[PDB]
Design a protein around this ligand. Structure first.
Ligand SMILES: CC(=O)N[C@@H]1CCC[C@H](C(=O)Nc2cc(-c3cnn4c3CC(C)(C)C4)c(Cl)cn2)C1
Lengths: 252, 314
Protein backbone atom coordinates (compact mmCIF):
# COMPACT_ATOMS: atom_id res chain seq x y z
CA UNK A 1 0.00 0.00 0.00
CA UNK A 2 0.94 3.73 -0.65
CA UNK A 3 0.38 4.82 3.10
CA UNK A 4 1.75 1.56 4.56
CA UNK A 5 5.02 3.03 5.74
CA UNK A 6 3.71 6.58 6.52
CA UNK A 7 2.52 7.27 10.01
CA UNK A 8 0.63 9.96 11.96
CA UNK A 9 2.30 11.52 15.01
CA UNK A 10 -0.19 9.56 17.18
CA UNK A 11 0.84 6.31 15.39
CA UNK A 12 4.49 7.27 16.06
CA UNK A 13 3.63 7.88 19.71
CA UNK A 14 1.93 4.43 20.07
CA UNK A 15 4.99 2.57 18.69
CA UNK A 16 5.92 -1.10 19.38
CA UNK A 17 8.69 0.11 21.75
CA UNK A 18 6.18 2.37 23.64
CA UNK A 19 4.14 -0.75 24.34
CA UNK A 20 7.17 -2.18 26.25
CA UNK A 21 7.75 0.99 28.29
CA UNK A 22 10.29 2.85 26.15
CA UNK A 23 9.80 6.65 26.51
CA UNK A 24 9.39 8.65 23.25
CA UNK A 25 12.66 10.51 23.69
CA UNK A 26 14.53 7.29 24.54
CA UNK A 27 13.16 5.66 21.33
CA UNK A 28 14.33 8.63 19.26
CA UNK A 29 17.82 8.19 20.78
CA UNK A 30 17.77 4.44 20.05
CA UNK A 31 17.03 5.37 16.41
CA UNK A 32 19.79 8.02 16.31
CA UNK A 33 22.32 5.51 17.79
CA UNK A 34 21.40 2.91 15.16
CA UNK A 35 21.80 5.49 12.32
CA UNK A 36 25.24 6.44 13.74
CA UNK A 37 26.31 2.76 13.93
CA UNK A 38 25.15 2.30 10.34
CA UNK A 39 27.15 5.34 9.23
CA UNK A 40 30.26 4.17 11.17
CA UNK A 41 30.14 0.64 9.74
CA UNK A 42 29.19 1.88 6.28
CA UNK A 43 32.21 4.18 6.18
CA UNK A 44 34.56 1.37 7.24
CA UNK A 45 32.99 -1.08 4.70
CA UNK A 46 33.33 1.60 2.02
CA UNK A 47 29.70 1.40 0.93
CA UNK A 48 27.95 4.48 -0.52
CA UNK A 49 25.92 7.08 1.50
CA UNK A 50 22.98 5.80 -0.56
CA UNK A 51 23.51 2.30 0.89
CA UNK A 52 23.82 3.70 4.42
CA UNK A 53 20.67 5.80 3.87
CA UNK A 54 18.75 2.75 2.61
CA UNK A 55 19.83 0.78 5.73
CA UNK A 56 18.65 3.73 7.93
CA UNK A 57 15.14 3.63 6.34
CA UNK A 58 15.05 -0.14 6.88
CA UNK A 59 15.88 0.44 10.57
CA UNK A 60 13.27 3.20 10.94
CA UNK A 61 10.56 1.05 9.35
CA UNK A 62 11.68 -2.09 11.19
CA UNK A 63 11.04 -0.33 14.52
CA UNK A 64 7.49 0.72 13.57
CA UNK A 65 6.79 -3.06 13.74
CA UNK A 66 9.32 -4.44 16.21
CA UNK A 67 10.37 -3.24 19.67
CA UNK A 68 13.84 -2.02 20.74
CA UNK A 69 13.19 -4.15 23.85
CA UNK A 70 13.19 -7.34 21.70
CA UNK A 71 15.64 -6.31 18.95
CA UNK A 72 18.58 -4.12 20.04
CA UNK A 73 19.86 -1.55 17.54
CA UNK A 74 23.37 -3.03 17.77
CA UNK A 75 22.00 -6.34 16.41
CA UNK A 76 19.63 -4.97 13.74
CA UNK A 77 22.04 -2.29 12.29
CA UNK A 78 24.66 -4.83 10.98
CA UNK A 79 21.92 -7.04 9.47
CA UNK A 80 20.11 -3.94 7.96
CA UNK A 81 23.39 -2.76 6.37
CA UNK A 82 24.33 -6.25 5.12
CA UNK A 83 20.89 -6.38 3.44
CA UNK A 84 21.02 -2.78 2.08
CA UNK A 85 24.49 -3.33 0.55
CA UNK A 86 23.06 -6.39 -1.32
CA UNK A 87 19.91 -4.49 -2.33
CA UNK A 88 21.85 -1.43 -3.51
CA UNK A 89 24.29 -3.59 -5.52
CA UNK A 90 27.38 -3.09 -3.34
CA UNK A 91 27.34 -6.59 -1.77
CA UNK A 92 29.64 -7.02 1.18
CA UNK A 93 30.59 -10.49 2.45
CA UNK A 94 28.98 -11.78 5.64
CA UNK A 95 32.40 -12.39 7.35
CA UNK A 96 33.38 -8.84 6.32
CA UNK A 97 30.28 -7.16 7.83
CA UNK A 98 30.71 -9.23 10.99
CA UNK A 99 34.38 -8.22 11.41
CA UNK A 100 33.52 -4.47 10.98
CA UNK A 101 30.45 -4.60 13.24
CA UNK A 102 32.67 -6.21 15.90
CA UNK A 103 35.37 -3.53 15.79
CA UNK A 104 32.74 -0.75 15.95
CA UNK A 105 31.00 -2.33 18.91
CA UNK A 106 34.05 -3.79 20.75
CA UNK A 107 37.21 -1.78 19.84
CA UNK A 108 39.24 -3.31 22.66
CA UNK A 109 38.00 -6.88 22.18
CA UNK A 110 39.51 -9.23 19.60
CA UNK A 111 37.44 -10.97 16.92
CA UNK A 112 36.85 -14.63 17.92
CA UNK A 113 38.48 -17.39 15.91
CA UNK A 114 36.52 -17.90 12.69
CA UNK A 115 36.49 -21.64 13.68
CA UNK A 116 34.92 -21.07 17.18
CA UNK A 117 31.32 -21.93 18.03
CA UNK A 118 30.86 -18.37 19.34
CA UNK A 119 31.83 -16.92 15.93
CA UNK A 120 29.79 -19.49 13.96
CA UNK A 121 26.84 -18.39 16.10
CA UNK A 122 27.16 -14.65 15.47
CA UNK A 123 27.37 -15.41 11.72
CA UNK A 124 24.08 -17.30 12.10
CA UNK A 125 22.52 -14.52 14.22
CA UNK A 126 23.08 -12.01 11.40
CA UNK A 127 21.54 -14.32 8.75
CA UNK A 128 18.50 -14.89 11.02
CA UNK A 129 18.11 -11.19 11.66
CA UNK A 130 18.39 -10.25 7.92
CA UNK A 131 15.52 -12.70 7.36
CA UNK A 132 13.43 -11.07 10.15
CA UNK A 133 14.08 -7.68 8.51
CA UNK A 134 13.01 -8.88 5.03
CA UNK A 135 9.79 -10.23 6.53
CA UNK A 136 9.08 -7.18 8.73
CA UNK A 137 9.36 -4.92 5.64
CA UNK A 138 7.33 -7.41 3.66
CA UNK A 139 10.11 -7.54 1.04
CA UNK A 140 9.50 -3.82 0.04
CA UNK A 141 13.22 -2.91 -0.14
CA UNK A 142 13.22 -0.34 -2.93
CA UNK A 143 13.68 2.99 -1.14
CA UNK A 144 13.09 6.45 -2.52
CA UNK A 145 15.37 8.92 -0.79
CA UNK A 146 14.82 12.61 -0.88
CA UNK A 147 18.40 13.16 -2.23
CA UNK A 148 17.00 12.19 -5.68
CA UNK A 149 14.51 15.09 -5.46
CA UNK A 150 17.00 17.57 -4.02
CA UNK A 151 19.28 17.23 -7.08
CA UNK A 152 16.17 17.83 -9.31
CA UNK A 153 15.07 20.91 -7.38
CA UNK A 154 18.49 22.59 -6.70
CA UNK A 155 18.93 22.63 -10.52
CA UNK A 156 15.36 23.79 -11.27
CA UNK A 157 16.19 26.69 -8.77
CA UNK A 158 19.74 27.39 -10.20
CA UNK A 159 21.46 26.99 -6.78
CA UNK A 160 25.21 27.46 -6.08
CA UNK A 161 27.29 24.22 -5.59
CA UNK A 162 27.26 25.38 -1.97
CA UNK A 163 23.46 25.56 -1.68
CA UNK A 164 22.99 22.17 -3.30
CA UNK A 165 25.70 20.58 -1.09
CA UNK A 166 24.14 22.10 2.07
CA UNK A 167 20.76 20.63 1.00
CA UNK A 168 22.17 17.10 0.53
CA UNK A 169 23.67 17.47 4.03
CA UNK A 170 20.22 18.40 5.41
CA UNK A 171 18.70 15.39 3.62
CA UNK A 172 21.30 12.93 5.08
CA UNK A 173 20.98 14.36 8.58
CA UNK A 174 17.15 14.26 8.43
CA UNK A 175 17.57 10.40 8.22
CA UNK A 176 19.96 10.27 11.20
CA UNK A 177 18.19 12.77 13.42
CA UNK A 178 14.42 12.60 12.60
CA UNK A 179 11.55 10.28 11.73
CA UNK A 180 10.59 12.44 8.71
CA UNK A 181 11.14 9.32 6.55
CA UNK A 182 8.22 7.66 8.40
CA UNK A 183 5.98 10.75 8.05
CA UNK A 184 6.64 12.76 4.90
CA UNK A 185 7.15 11.70 1.27
CA UNK A 186 10.71 12.11 -0.09
CA UNK A 187 9.70 15.10 -2.40
CA UNK A 188 8.30 16.86 0.71
CA UNK A 189 11.38 16.04 2.83
CA UNK A 190 13.47 17.38 -0.12
CA UNK A 191 11.54 20.69 0.06
CA UNK A 192 12.18 20.88 3.85
CA UNK A 193 15.95 20.44 3.21
CA UNK A 194 16.17 23.03 0.40
CA UNK A 195 14.14 25.47 2.51
CA UNK A 196 16.43 25.10 5.60
CA UNK A 197 19.57 25.24 3.43
CA UNK A 198 18.33 28.55 1.99
CA UNK A 199 17.56 29.95 5.46
CA UNK A 200 21.02 28.84 6.72
CA UNK A 201 22.83 30.35 3.65
CA UNK A 202 20.66 33.52 3.48
CA UNK A 203 19.65 32.47 -0.05
CA UNK A 204 16.30 33.51 -1.48
CA UNK A 205 14.72 31.64 -4.38
CA UNK A 206 12.69 34.17 -6.43
CA UNK A 207 8.99 33.71 -7.30
CA UNK A 208 8.37 32.18 -10.75
CA UNK A 209 6.94 34.37 -13.59
CA UNK A 210 3.56 32.58 -12.97
CA UNK A 211 3.53 33.68 -9.30
CA UNK A 212 4.32 30.13 -8.14
CA UNK A 213 6.78 29.39 -5.28
CA UNK A 214 9.63 26.91 -6.09
CA UNK A 215 8.22 24.06 -3.97
CA UNK A 216 4.90 24.05 -5.93
CA UNK A 217 6.92 22.62 -8.85
CA UNK A 218 8.24 19.84 -6.53
CA UNK A 219 5.13 18.71 -4.59
CA UNK A 220 1.52 19.94 -4.84
CA UNK A 221 0.67 19.11 -1.19
CA UNK A 222 3.54 21.27 0.22
CA UNK A 223 2.70 24.55 2.08
CA UNK A 224 5.03 27.28 3.51
CA UNK A 225 3.39 26.75 6.95
CA UNK A 226 4.50 23.10 6.96
CA UNK A 227 7.97 23.97 5.55
CA UNK A 228 8.57 26.45 8.38
CA UNK A 229 7.30 23.99 11.02
CA UNK A 230 9.53 21.18 9.70
CA UNK A 231 12.66 23.35 9.13
CA UNK A 232 12.40 24.57 12.71
CA UNK A 233 12.18 20.96 14.05
CA UNK A 234 15.19 19.85 11.92
CA UNK A 235 17.23 22.95 12.87
CA UNK A 236 16.66 22.35 16.59
CA UNK A 237 17.90 18.72 16.46
CA UNK A 238 20.88 19.93 14.35
CA UNK A 239 21.79 22.53 17.06
CA UNK A 240 21.74 19.71 19.63
CA UNK A 241 24.21 17.63 17.47
CA UNK A 242 27.78 18.62 18.33
CA UNK A 243 30.05 19.50 15.40
CA UNK A 244 27.32 18.64 12.86
CA UNK A 245 26.46 22.32 12.04
CA UNK A 246 30.25 23.11 11.96
CA UNK A 247 30.33 21.03 8.74
CA UNK A 248 28.08 23.58 6.98
CA UNK A 249 29.14 26.73 8.85
CA UNK A 250 30.27 29.63 6.75
CA UNK A 251 32.99 31.29 8.70
CA UNK A 252 33.68 34.13 6.24
CA UNK B 1 12.25 -15.70 15.85
CA UNK B 2 9.58 -18.48 16.55
CA UNK B 3 6.93 -15.91 17.92
CA UNK B 4 7.73 -12.60 16.08
CA UNK B 5 5.13 -10.14 14.61
CA UNK B 6 4.96 -10.21 10.82
CA UNK B 7 2.07 -8.19 9.40
CA UNK B 8 3.33 -7.93 5.85
CA UNK B 9 4.66 -11.42 5.28
CA UNK B 10 1.95 -14.06 5.37
CA UNK B 11 2.59 -17.78 5.92
CA UNK B 12 2.32 -19.79 2.61
CA UNK B 13 -0.07 -22.16 4.43
CA UNK B 14 -2.85 -19.74 3.30
CA UNK B 15 -2.49 -21.44 -0.11
CA UNK B 16 -3.08 -25.17 -0.57
CA UNK B 17 -0.48 -27.01 -2.75
CA UNK B 18 -2.27 -28.83 -5.57
CA UNK B 19 0.53 -29.98 -7.93
CA UNK B 20 4.26 -29.53 -8.77
CA UNK B 21 4.53 -27.78 -12.21
CA UNK B 22 8.33 -27.13 -12.30
CA UNK B 23 10.66 -30.22 -12.22
CA UNK B 24 12.11 -29.69 -15.73
CA UNK B 25 15.11 -27.23 -15.69
CA UNK B 26 13.63 -25.23 -12.78
CA UNK B 27 13.56 -25.69 -9.00
CA UNK B 28 10.28 -25.72 -7.04
CA UNK B 29 7.07 -24.39 -8.69
CA UNK B 30 3.61 -25.46 -7.40
CA UNK B 31 0.06 -24.83 -8.56
CA UNK B 32 -1.94 -23.87 -5.47
CA UNK B 33 -5.38 -22.71 -4.26
CA UNK B 34 -6.18 -19.90 -1.84
CA UNK B 35 -7.82 -21.75 1.09
CA UNK B 36 -10.64 -19.11 1.49
CA UNK B 37 -11.42 -17.80 -2.02
CA UNK B 38 -10.21 -20.63 -4.24
CA UNK B 39 -7.98 -18.24 -6.19
CA UNK B 40 -5.44 -20.27 -8.17
CA UNK B 41 -1.82 -19.17 -7.84
CA UNK B 42 1.71 -20.42 -8.60
CA UNK B 43 4.18 -20.74 -5.71
CA UNK B 44 7.89 -20.51 -6.57
CA UNK B 45 10.15 -21.51 -3.65
CA UNK B 46 13.35 -19.43 -3.25
CA UNK B 47 16.12 -22.01 -3.34
CA UNK B 48 18.77 -22.11 -0.69
CA UNK B 49 21.37 -24.60 -2.16
CA UNK B 50 24.90 -23.14 -1.56
CA UNK B 51 23.65 -19.91 0.12
CA UNK B 52 26.55 -18.93 2.35
CA UNK B 53 25.72 -15.20 2.14
CA UNK B 54 22.27 -15.11 3.68
CA UNK B 55 19.21 -14.36 1.52
CA UNK B 56 20.11 -14.84 -2.13
CA UNK B 57 21.15 -11.65 -3.91
CA UNK B 58 19.76 -13.35 -7.06
CA UNK B 59 16.32 -13.65 -5.43
CA UNK B 60 16.50 -10.02 -4.24
CA UNK B 61 17.14 -9.01 -7.89
CA UNK B 62 14.19 -11.10 -9.28
CA UNK B 63 11.88 -9.74 -6.56
CA UNK B 64 12.99 -6.15 -7.30
CA UNK B 65 12.29 -6.72 -11.04
CA UNK B 66 8.92 -8.46 -10.39
CA UNK B 67 7.83 -5.55 -8.16
CA UNK B 68 8.79 -3.05 -10.87
CA UNK B 69 7.16 -4.81 -13.85
CA UNK B 70 3.39 -4.24 -13.87
CA UNK B 71 1.91 -4.97 -17.29
CA UNK B 72 -0.84 -7.06 -18.92
CA UNK B 73 1.73 -9.17 -20.75
CA UNK B 74 4.13 -9.72 -17.79
CA UNK B 75 3.55 -12.30 -15.03
CA UNK B 76 2.21 -10.76 -11.73
CA UNK B 77 3.88 -11.21 -8.35
CA UNK B 78 0.94 -11.08 -5.83
CA UNK B 79 3.09 -11.30 -2.69
CA UNK B 80 6.03 -13.04 -0.93
CA UNK B 81 5.17 -15.70 1.68
CA UNK B 82 7.24 -17.29 4.51
CA UNK B 83 6.86 -20.59 6.33
CA UNK B 84 6.96 -20.52 10.21
CA UNK B 85 15.64 -25.02 12.40
CA UNK B 86 15.41 -23.43 8.84
CA UNK B 87 12.34 -22.06 6.91
CA UNK B 88 11.61 -21.24 3.24
CA UNK B 89 10.27 -18.26 1.16
CA UNK B 90 7.78 -18.36 -1.75
CA UNK B 91 7.02 -15.98 -4.60
CA UNK B 92 3.25 -16.02 -5.22
CA UNK B 93 2.03 -15.37 -8.81
CA UNK B 94 -1.44 -15.30 -10.34
CA UNK B 95 -1.85 -18.70 -12.02
CA UNK B 96 -1.83 -19.04 -15.86
CA UNK B 97 -3.65 -22.09 -17.25
CA UNK B 98 -1.36 -22.80 -20.33
CA UNK B 99 2.23 -22.41 -21.66
CA UNK B 100 3.26 -21.88 -25.31
CA UNK B 101 5.59 -24.95 -25.25
CA UNK B 102 2.64 -27.12 -24.13
CA UNK B 103 0.04 -25.81 -26.60
CA UNK B 104 2.57 -26.12 -29.42
CA UNK B 105 3.55 -29.69 -28.47
CA UNK B 106 -0.19 -30.59 -28.56
CA UNK B 107 -1.40 -31.99 -31.89
CA UNK B 108 -5.06 -31.39 -30.91
CA UNK B 109 -4.37 -27.62 -30.42
CA UNK B 110 -4.73 -25.59 -33.60
CA UNK B 111 -4.05 -21.86 -34.23
CA UNK B 112 -5.47 -19.70 -37.02
CA UNK B 113 -3.25 -17.08 -38.69
CA UNK B 114 -5.36 -14.47 -36.82
CA UNK B 115 -4.55 -15.94 -33.39
CA UNK B 116 -0.82 -16.43 -34.17
CA UNK B 117 -0.83 -12.69 -34.97
CA UNK B 118 -2.39 -11.98 -31.54
CA UNK B 119 0.14 -14.20 -29.65
CA UNK B 120 3.09 -12.43 -31.30
CA UNK B 121 1.49 -9.04 -30.66
CA UNK B 122 1.18 -9.64 -26.88
CA UNK B 123 4.70 -11.15 -26.71
CA UNK B 124 6.29 -8.20 -28.50
CA UNK B 125 4.26 -5.76 -26.41
CA UNK B 126 5.50 -7.44 -23.21
CA UNK B 127 9.09 -7.14 -24.52
CA UNK B 128 8.61 -3.52 -25.43
CA UNK B 129 7.43 -2.82 -21.86
CA UNK B 130 10.22 -4.68 -20.05
CA UNK B 131 12.94 -3.13 -22.25
CA UNK B 132 11.37 0.37 -21.89
CA UNK B 133 11.86 -0.31 -18.10
CA UNK B 134 15.55 -1.15 -18.64
CA UNK B 135 15.12 -4.90 -18.04
CA UNK B 136 16.52 -7.72 -20.19
CA UNK B 137 14.55 -11.00 -19.86
CA UNK B 138 17.54 -13.15 -20.92
CA UNK B 139 15.57 -16.44 -20.98
CA UNK B 140 13.22 -16.22 -23.91
CA UNK B 141 11.63 -19.68 -24.73
CA UNK B 142 8.18 -21.16 -25.48
CA UNK B 143 8.08 -22.75 -21.99
CA UNK B 144 8.58 -19.27 -20.36
CA UNK B 145 5.60 -17.80 -22.31
CA UNK B 146 2.30 -18.35 -20.53
CA UNK B 147 -1.32 -17.82 -21.63
CA UNK B 148 -4.29 -17.29 -19.28
CA UNK B 149 -7.71 -19.01 -19.56
CA UNK B 150 -8.80 -15.68 -21.08
CA UNK B 151 -6.16 -15.77 -23.79
CA UNK B 152 -3.77 -13.20 -22.25
CA UNK B 153 -0.06 -13.95 -22.86
CA UNK B 154 2.38 -13.31 -19.98
CA UNK B 155 6.19 -13.30 -20.07
CA UNK B 156 7.31 -15.52 -17.15
CA UNK B 157 10.46 -16.59 -15.22
CA UNK B 158 12.49 -13.41 -14.54
CA UNK B 159 15.06 -15.39 -12.52
CA UNK B 160 17.71 -14.68 -15.10
CA UNK B 161 16.43 -11.14 -15.90
CA UNK B 162 18.63 -8.15 -15.16
CA UNK B 163 18.55 -4.35 -15.32
CA UNK B 164 20.60 -2.75 -18.14
CA UNK B 165 22.07 0.69 -18.81
CA UNK B 166 23.25 3.34 -21.32
CA UNK B 167 33.28 2.49 -20.23
CA UNK B 168 31.56 -0.73 -21.71
CA UNK B 169 29.00 -3.00 -20.00
CA UNK B 170 30.23 -6.45 -18.87
CA UNK B 171 27.01 -8.45 -18.58
CA UNK B 172 27.12 -12.26 -18.09
CA UNK B 173 27.49 -14.45 -21.26
CA UNK B 174 26.07 -17.51 -19.40
CA UNK B 175 22.56 -16.27 -20.55
CA UNK B 176 19.63 -17.78 -22.54
CA UNK B 177 18.95 -21.48 -23.24
CA UNK B 178 21.11 -22.75 -26.12
CA UNK B 179 18.38 -23.24 -28.77
CA UNK B 180 17.16 -19.70 -28.25
CA UNK B 181 20.59 -18.10 -27.75
CA UNK B 182 21.48 -15.32 -30.23
CA UNK B 183 24.71 -15.21 -32.36
CA UNK B 184 26.21 -12.31 -30.28
CA UNK B 185 26.34 -14.44 -27.11
CA UNK B 186 27.72 -17.49 -29.00
CA UNK B 187 30.48 -15.17 -30.33
CA UNK B 188 31.26 -14.04 -26.74
CA UNK B 189 29.51 -10.64 -26.47
CA UNK B 190 29.19 -9.07 -22.94
CA UNK B 191 27.94 -5.61 -24.00
CA UNK B 192 24.57 -6.78 -25.35
CA UNK B 193 21.06 -5.42 -25.01
CA UNK B 194 17.40 -5.87 -25.90
CA UNK B 195 18.09 -7.54 -29.31
CA UNK B 196 18.92 -10.81 -27.45
CA UNK B 197 15.25 -11.12 -26.38
CA UNK B 198 14.09 -10.39 -29.95
CA UNK B 199 16.18 -13.18 -31.46
CA UNK B 200 14.31 -15.42 -28.97
CA UNK B 201 11.01 -13.85 -30.19
CA UNK B 202 12.01 -14.83 -33.74
CA UNK B 203 12.66 -18.48 -32.72
CA UNK B 204 9.28 -18.59 -30.95
CA UNK B 205 7.44 -17.00 -33.91
CA UNK B 206 8.80 -19.62 -36.32
CA UNK B 207 7.86 -22.27 -33.71
CA UNK B 208 4.15 -21.16 -34.05
CA UNK B 209 4.07 -22.92 -37.47
CA UNK B 210 6.90 -25.53 -37.23
CA UNK B 211 5.53 -26.63 -33.80
CA UNK B 212 9.17 -27.44 -32.90
CA UNK B 213 12.32 -25.40 -32.01
CA UNK B 214 13.83 -24.53 -35.43
CA UNK B 215 17.52 -24.84 -34.31
CA UNK B 216 18.26 -27.61 -31.76
CA UNK B 217 22.04 -27.52 -31.20
CA UNK B 218 24.02 -29.72 -28.77
CA UNK B 219 26.99 -27.38 -28.16
CA UNK B 220 27.72 -23.69 -28.88
CA UNK B 221 29.66 -24.76 -32.05
CA UNK B 222 26.67 -26.90 -33.17
CA UNK B 223 24.30 -23.99 -32.44
CA UNK B 224 26.46 -21.53 -34.41
CA UNK B 225 26.57 -24.02 -37.28
CA UNK B 226 22.79 -24.55 -37.21
CA UNK B 227 22.25 -20.73 -37.28
CA UNK B 228 24.56 -20.50 -40.35
CA UNK B 229 22.62 -23.27 -42.15
CA UNK B 230 19.49 -21.07 -41.73
CA UNK B 231 20.50 -17.36 -41.64
CA UNK B 232 23.43 -17.52 -44.03
CA UNK B 233 27.03 -17.34 -42.78
CA UNK B 234 28.63 -14.85 -40.33
CA UNK B 235 30.31 -12.28 -42.64
CA UNK B 236 31.73 -8.78 -41.85
CA UNK B 237 29.73 -7.85 -45.00
CA UNK B 238 26.48 -9.17 -43.47
CA UNK B 239 27.47 -8.29 -39.87
CA UNK B 240 29.80 -5.21 -39.86
CA UNK B 241 32.67 -5.74 -37.37
CA UNK B 242 31.69 -9.35 -36.54
CA UNK B 243 35.45 -10.13 -37.06
CA UNK B 244 36.52 -9.21 -33.53
CA UNK B 245 36.90 -11.96 -30.78
CA UNK B 246 36.36 -15.19 -32.72
CA UNK B 247 34.94 -15.73 -36.32
CA UNK B 248 38.64 -16.68 -37.15
CA UNK B 249 39.89 -17.22 -33.52
CA UNK B 250 38.90 -20.90 -33.59
CA UNK B 251 35.03 -21.27 -33.50
CA UNK B 252 35.35 -23.05 -36.88
CA UNK B 253 32.53 -21.48 -38.82
CA UNK B 254 31.13 -22.23 -42.31
CA UNK B 255 31.92 -19.96 -45.27
CA UNK B 256 29.57 -20.86 -48.17
CA UNK B 257 26.15 -20.81 -46.40
CA UNK B 258 23.40 -18.60 -47.92
CA UNK B 259 20.18 -17.29 -46.22
CA UNK B 260 17.42 -19.95 -46.32
CA UNK B 261 15.14 -18.46 -43.57
CA UNK B 262 12.27 -17.77 -45.97
CA UNK B 263 12.87 -20.93 -48.06
CA UNK B 264 13.03 -23.45 -45.17
CA UNK B 265 9.96 -21.91 -43.46
CA UNK B 266 8.17 -21.17 -46.78
CA UNK B 267 6.44 -24.58 -46.35
CA UNK B 268 4.92 -24.10 -42.85
CA UNK B 269 4.21 -20.36 -42.80
CA UNK B 270 2.90 -19.49 -46.34
CA UNK B 271 1.81 -15.94 -45.27
CA UNK B 272 4.25 -13.40 -46.84
CA UNK B 273 4.10 -10.91 -43.94
CA UNK B 274 4.75 -13.58 -41.27
CA UNK B 275 7.77 -14.79 -43.28
CA UNK B 276 9.07 -11.23 -43.68
CA UNK B 277 8.79 -10.46 -39.95
CA UNK B 278 10.47 -13.76 -38.94
CA UNK B 279 13.27 -12.91 -41.42
CA UNK B 280 13.71 -9.48 -39.73
CA UNK B 281 13.76 -11.08 -36.22
CA UNK B 282 16.29 -13.85 -37.10
CA UNK B 283 18.84 -11.26 -38.31
CA UNK B 284 22.51 -11.99 -37.51
CA UNK B 285 23.71 -8.45 -36.68
CA UNK B 286 22.00 -7.48 -33.38
CA UNK B 287 22.13 -3.85 -34.59
CA UNK B 288 20.21 -4.71 -37.82
CA UNK B 289 17.73 -6.99 -35.95
CA UNK B 290 14.27 -5.42 -35.70
CA UNK B 291 13.20 -4.03 -32.30
CA UNK B 292 9.87 -4.71 -30.52
CA UNK B 293 8.62 -1.24 -31.50
CA UNK B 294 9.20 -1.66 -35.21
CA UNK B 295 8.07 -5.31 -35.09
CA UNK B 296 4.74 -4.20 -33.62
CA UNK B 297 4.46 -1.70 -36.55
CA UNK B 298 5.13 -4.43 -39.17
CA UNK B 299 2.33 -5.02 -41.74
CA UNK B 300 1.87 -8.56 -40.27
CA UNK B 301 -0.16 -6.93 -37.42
CA UNK B 302 -1.92 -4.46 -39.72
CA UNK B 303 -3.18 -6.58 -42.64
CA UNK B 304 -6.05 -9.07 -43.03
CA UNK B 305 -6.87 -11.31 -41.25
CA UNK B 306 -6.37 -8.79 -38.42
CA UNK B 307 -5.21 -10.16 -34.95
CA UNK B 308 -8.05 -11.97 -33.08
CA UNK B 309 -8.83 -13.15 -29.54
CA UNK B 310 -7.80 -16.54 -28.14
CA UNK B 311 -10.61 -19.18 -28.07
CA UNK B 312 -8.41 -21.73 -29.97
CA UNK B 313 -8.24 -23.11 -27.33
CA UNK B 314 -10.55 -24.11 -25.50
C1 LIG C 1 -0.63 -29.15 -13.09
C2 LIG C 1 -0.94 -28.01 -14.02
O1 LIG C 1 -2.01 -27.39 -13.95
N1 LIG C 1 0.02 -27.72 -14.92
C3 LIG C 1 -0.05 -26.59 -15.85
C4 LIG C 1 0.42 -26.98 -17.23
C5 LIG C 1 0.32 -25.79 -18.19
C6 LIG C 1 1.16 -24.62 -17.70
C7 LIG C 1 0.76 -24.21 -16.27
C8 LIG C 1 1.77 -23.27 -15.67
O2 LIG C 1 2.99 -23.46 -15.78
N2 LIG C 1 1.23 -22.23 -15.00
C9 LIG C 1 1.88 -21.20 -14.33
C10 LIG C 1 3.25 -21.25 -14.09
C11 LIG C 1 3.87 -20.16 -13.50
C12 LIG C 1 5.34 -20.21 -13.23
C13 LIG C 1 6.09 -19.68 -12.17
N3 LIG C 1 7.39 -19.91 -12.31
N4 LIG C 1 7.47 -20.60 -13.48
C14 LIG C 1 6.26 -20.81 -14.06
C15 LIG C 1 6.40 -21.89 -15.08
C16 LIG C 1 7.91 -21.83 -15.38
C17 LIG C 1 8.42 -23.18 -15.86
C18 LIG C 1 8.25 -20.75 -16.41
C19 LIG C 1 8.51 -21.47 -14.01
C20 LIG C 1 3.07 -19.06 -13.20
CL1 LIG C 1 3.75 -17.61 -12.54
C21 LIG C 1 1.71 -19.10 -13.45
N5 LIG C 1 1.12 -20.16 -14.01
C22 LIG C 1 0.77 -25.42 -15.33
Amino acid sequence: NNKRWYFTREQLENSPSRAFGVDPDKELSYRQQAANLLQDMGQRLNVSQLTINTAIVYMHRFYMIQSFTRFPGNSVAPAALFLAAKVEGQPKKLEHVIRVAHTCLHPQESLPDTRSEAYLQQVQDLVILESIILQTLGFELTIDHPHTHVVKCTQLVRASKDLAQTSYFMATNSLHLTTFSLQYTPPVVACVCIHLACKWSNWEIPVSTDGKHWWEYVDATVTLELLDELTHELLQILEKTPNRLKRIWNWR
Amino acid sequence: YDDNECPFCDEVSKYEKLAKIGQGTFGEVFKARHRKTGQRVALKKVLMENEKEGFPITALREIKILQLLKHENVVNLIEICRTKCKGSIYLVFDFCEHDLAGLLSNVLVKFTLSEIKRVMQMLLNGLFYIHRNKILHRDMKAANVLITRDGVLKLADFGLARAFSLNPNRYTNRVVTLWYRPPELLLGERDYGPPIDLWGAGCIMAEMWTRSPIMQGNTEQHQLALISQLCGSITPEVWPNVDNYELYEKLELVKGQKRKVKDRLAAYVRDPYALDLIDKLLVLDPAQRIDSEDALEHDFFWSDPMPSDLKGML
